[PDB]
Design a protein around this ligand. Structure first.
Ligand SMILES: CCCCCCCCCCCCCCCCCCCCCCCCCC(=O)N[C@@H](CO[C@H]1O[C@H](CO)[C@H](O)[C@H](O)[C@H]1O)[C@H](O)[C@H](O)CCCC(=O)NCCCCCCc1ccccc1
Ligand SMILES: *[C@@H]1O[C@H](CO[C@@H]2O[C@@H](C)[C@@H](O)[C@@H](O)[C@@H]2O)[C@@H](O[C@@H]2O[C@H](CO)[C@@H](O)[C@H](O)[C@H]2NC(C)=O)[C@H](O)[C@H]1NC(C)=O
Ligand SMILES: *[C@@H]1O[C@H](CO)[C@@H](O)[C@H](O)[C@H]1NC(C)=O
Ligand SMILES: *[C@@H]1O[C@H](CO)[C@@H](O)[C@H](O)[C@H]1NC(C)=O
Ligand code: NA
Ligand code: NA
Ligand code: NA
Ligand code: NA
Ligand code: NA
Ligand code: NA
Ligand code: NA
Lengths: 239, 266, 201, 98
């Protein structure tokens, strides 16, 4: 029994309209929306016993719920505020007690969008010293110059995502820690065997999914509108 | 041959206001009450604990305390689930307990009424709707039947705890259950004569107008009406021609009189 | 709150056991579930306990429930690096969809990796496009070593991070350093790096 | 929504000047929300004891009100019931016979 949420990640502005959706193909009557904030357990916002039903949970204020069909349950923030920055979880269930949770949605509500900027991405190739000293090859990926910190970094080898041999900084670091709206940097490593790096049919790619403005957000500055986008860097193996 | 009855009445006026009150009867004697205002169940007889230890009683009361709060939220939540099919105000009644037969035998029951109509019972291992019930109740039933912990608890209450408890109550309350209280009678008119009979326990009684040894077949018994001291009141009327009242007597038979019938001549 | 978890957080070394507590006042208490939440990820159910006095197991995880004391414990035998997560206790107050869930705030577990054969070294790596830009990679140091943050704010140094090459049963720590306005010999001076660190070229 | 039946009757045989108890028995009503007053000479009697509300086999409610009274030649006694099933209050007078 599966449950999906869209979007998975969203940057929004105070006063904007944000709609978080949950889809559910189990033919479950019951659906439930929670938010998770650090220092508290998940708290119930709204829920629904079927198409057209919407009920207030424990913390419903600032949210409207909508159950247009058995499949979909939406959470509507009509006038978004910074206090609604959270991770939102949806769940479904039938008459039994089990609620089946979706993967969660990360929402950041900023005061203003003027500092939003996508990353520059750079891929750094393995040291030949490392290769001779260890028979292993470490690639490093660097994402820099971005704000806010909602980025997803992943590694792709020949068009397929890799997890083994990867580690990504648990938190982005600030480039100007004095400044309050400071741009961020983030690094990741992919360590492979020397012979795997040495094979020139292996195509390596570092990818950063950046969440920022949507098509319908107003942009007043001269620079390019900093939309949600992918930025990647790329390299082939060599002997 | 005694029936033990827990009678629960719950009024839900709107989504935020409700009350639940209970009374408990062993035959026609009140053994317990539980006002919405009280956190605990009240004994209305010295012997209302039966043969249960203080620890057994505390456990049982505690389970009921959890039930009353749990019941209250479940109904409100079931109303939301069926909305807008049914709405407030809502009345729910439960009648539960068991009838005790000779030997070691009993039948337990648990019947539920909605807006004055019997719609649901517990039977065997599950809740079910009864004949005449609306089909929309199938969803509440489905949800109630998903709760295995409640199913097992209710089965234990109905099959074991209730007949065991009631056996103890019958032993502990014997001298009240078997009490004998004498009727007192008096006469009056409006022609319609009235024989008033009051103060008798137990309920079985015989009341007839007489002309000597001739039983007047026109005698009409009213209903049994309660007095505040757990005795009964009954009246027997006879419709007659004015000036025909001479010769008529009212005769009353009751177990408490030991053969010595009351005879009141007009 | 109706559900309290202890410890708030804990740090253990790989291979060690640990115990996580959950105490609640929720009434009634139909069941208790333990969830595992990796950083930035979803809720993975580890076990559900339903009886008055209950015990469950799921591989290296085991749990107890005592409804009289309103107490549960989750036990992790022989912790691995992947157990680094938040562990969440949840009490359901009904055995049906009429129930409400009562979530604890969670316990943060950190598992320190066991580096068998350290080989501490600092390498220079060059950019794939513009060859005259670079980073420095301090790698292969054991978990005794602390990587201190950057003194000069024009130099950027990340905190340590462990990767796990699965098919080789191999784990390694690393930190990265870089700057524009710099060389790899001077990059990690403000940390207490091992005396035997390899600085090639 | 059924209408309440009301019956008024004394516990002991009525003798003028002699203390007694007067019963007002209200039956066969639903919903259970109800207002019961016992009246002397149209005025509301203050110390009126009420039994716990219960219900019959047919699911309809009942309750017994009672109060101490001493009947006389002149004083009237009555039981006044307000219920949602009636437009106006229903008052039944104690017959003096009952
Ligand atoms: C002396 C001997 C006397 C014998 C007479 C017995 C009287 C029988 C009557 C008492 C019945 C006692 C149930 C005890 C169990 C209970 O309390 N269940 C609760 C709580 O349950 C949770 O917690 C317990 C804790 O141990 C378990 O862990 C459970 O697993 C967990 O879910 C449930 O919320 C239950 O649902 C309460 C209500 C049960 C009930 O009324 N159902 C009938 C109502 C039908 C209504 C349908 C009509 C309707 C109206 C409006 C809208 C839709 C439908
Ligand atoms: C409890 O007893 C029932 C049978 O008793 C009847 O139902 C009670 C709730 C009560 O109303 C009694 O007066 C009735 O006589 C058992 O139900 C049976 O269970 C078996 C197997 O579990 C099942 O195959 C039967 O169909 C059930 N019988 C009926 C008539 O439906 C129940 O299991 C008993 N439970 C315990 C825990 O003792
Ligand atoms: C709910 O019902 C009660 C009792 O009938 C009434 O007094 C109260 O005003 C109602 N409350 C709301 C919020 O509607
Ligand atoms: C009945 O009791 C409950 C629980 O004690 C309480 O919250 C509620 O207000 C009471 N209802 C009324 C109408 O007094
Ligand atoms: Na929360
Ligand atoms: Na972002
Ligand atoms: Na409920
Ligand atoms: Na009812
Ligand atoms: Na059906
Ligand atoms: Na814990
Ligand atoms: Na490395």
């Amino acid at each position: 029994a599966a449950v999906t949420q869209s979007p998975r990640n969203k940057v929004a502005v105070t006063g904007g309209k944000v709609t978080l959706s949950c889809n559910q193909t189990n033919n479950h009557n019951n659906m439930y929306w929670y938010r998770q904030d650090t220092g508290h357990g998940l708290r119930l916002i709204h829920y629904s016993y079927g198409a057209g039903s919407t009920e207030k949970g424990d913390i419903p204020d600032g949210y409207k719920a909508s159950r247009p069909s058995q499949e979909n349950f939406s959470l509507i923030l009509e006038l978004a505020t910074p206090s609604q920055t959270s991770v939102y979880f949806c769940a479904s269930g039938d008459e039994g007690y089990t609620q089946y949770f979706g993967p969660g949605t990360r929402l950041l509500v900023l005061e203003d969008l003027r500092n939003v900027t996508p990353p520059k991405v750079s891929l750094f190739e393995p040291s030949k010293a490392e290769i001779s000293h260890t028979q292993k090859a470490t690639l490093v990926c660097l994402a820099t110059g971005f704000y806010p910190d909602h980025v997803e970094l992943s590694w792709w080898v020949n068009g397929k995502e890799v997890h083994s041999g990867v580690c990504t900084d648990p938190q982005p670091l600030k480039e100007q820690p004095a400044l309050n709206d400071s741009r961020y940097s983030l690094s990741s490593r992919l360590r492979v065997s020397a012979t795997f790096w040495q094979n020139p049919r292996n195509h390596f790619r570092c990818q950063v999914q950046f969440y920022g403005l949507s098509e319908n957000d107003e942009w007043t500055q001269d620079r390019a509108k900093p939309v949600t986008q992918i930025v990647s860097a790329e390299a082939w193996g060599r002997a | 041959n005694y029936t033990f009855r827990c009678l629960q009445m719950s009024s839900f006026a709107n989504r935020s206001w409700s009350r639940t009150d209970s009374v408990v009867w062993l035959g026609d004697l009140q053994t317990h009450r539980w006002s919405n205002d009280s956190a605990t169940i009240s004994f209305t007889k010295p012997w209302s604990q039966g043969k249960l230890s203080n620890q057994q009683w505390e456990k049982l009361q505690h389970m009921f305390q959890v039930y009353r709060v749990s019941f209250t939220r479940d109904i409100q939540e079931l109303v939301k689930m069926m909305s807008p099919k049914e709405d407030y105000p809502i009345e729910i009644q439960l009648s539960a307990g068991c009838e005790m037969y000779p030997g070691n035998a009993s039948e337990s029951f648990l019947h539920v009424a909605f807006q004055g109509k019997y719609v649901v019972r517990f039977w065997g291992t599950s809740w079910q709707t009864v004949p005449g019930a609306p089909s929309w109740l199938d969803l509440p039933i489905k949800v109630l039947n998903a709760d295995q912990g409640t199913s097992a608890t209710v089965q234990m209450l109905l099959n074991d705890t209730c007949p065991l408890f009631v056996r103890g109550l019958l032993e502990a309350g014997k001298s009240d259950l078997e009490k004998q209280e004498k009727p007192v009678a008096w006469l009056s008119s409006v022609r319609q004569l009235v024989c008033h009979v009051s103060g008798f326990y137990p309920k079985p009684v015989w009341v007839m107008w007489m002309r000597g040894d001739q039983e007047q077949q026109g005698t009409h018994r009213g209903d049994f009406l309660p007095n505040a001291d757990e005795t009964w009141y009954l009246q027997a009327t006879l419709d007659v021609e004015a000036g025909e009242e001479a010769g008529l007597a009212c005769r009353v038979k009751h177990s408490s009189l030991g053969g010595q019938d009351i005879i009141l001549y007009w | 709150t109706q559900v309290e978890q202890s410890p708030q957080s804990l740090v253990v070394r790989q291979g060690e056991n640990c115990v996580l507590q959950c105490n609640y006042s929720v009434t009634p208490d139909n069941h208790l579930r333990w969830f595992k939440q990796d950083t930035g990820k979803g809720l993975v159910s580890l076990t559900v306990l339903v009886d008055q006095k209950d015990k469950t197991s799921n591989g290296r995880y085991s749990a107890t429930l005592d409804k009289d004391a309103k107490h549960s414990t989750l036990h992790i035998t022989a912790t691995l690096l992947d157990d680094t997560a938040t562990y969440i206790c949840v009490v359901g107050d009904r055995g049906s969809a009429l129930g409400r869930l009562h979530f604890g705030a969670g316990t943060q577990l950190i598992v320190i990796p066991d580096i068998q054969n350290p080989d501490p070294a600092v390498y220079q790596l060059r950019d794939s496009k513009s060859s005259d830009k670079s980073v420095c990679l301090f790698t292969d140091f054991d978990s005794q070593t602390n990587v201190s943050q950057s003194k000069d704010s024009d130099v950027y140094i990340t905190d340590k991070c462990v990767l796990d090459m699965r098919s080789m049963d191999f784990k390694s720590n690393s930190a990265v350093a870089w700057s524009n306005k710099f060389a790899c010999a001077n990059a990690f001076n403000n940390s207490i790096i091992p005396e035997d660190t390899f600085f090639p070229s | 929504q059924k209408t309440p039946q009301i019956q008024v009757y004394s516990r002991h045989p009525p003798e003028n000047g002699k203390p007694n108890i007067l019963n007002c028995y209200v039956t066969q009503f639903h919903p259970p929300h109800i207002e019961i007053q016992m009246l002397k000479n149209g005025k509301k009697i203050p110390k009126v004891e009420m039994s716990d509300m219960s219900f019959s086999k047919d699911w309809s409610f009942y309750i017994l009100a009672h109060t101490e009274f001493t009947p006389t030649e002149t004083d009237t006694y009555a039981c006044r019931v307000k219920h949602a099933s009636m437009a106006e209050p229903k008052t039944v007078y104690w017959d003096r016979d009952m």
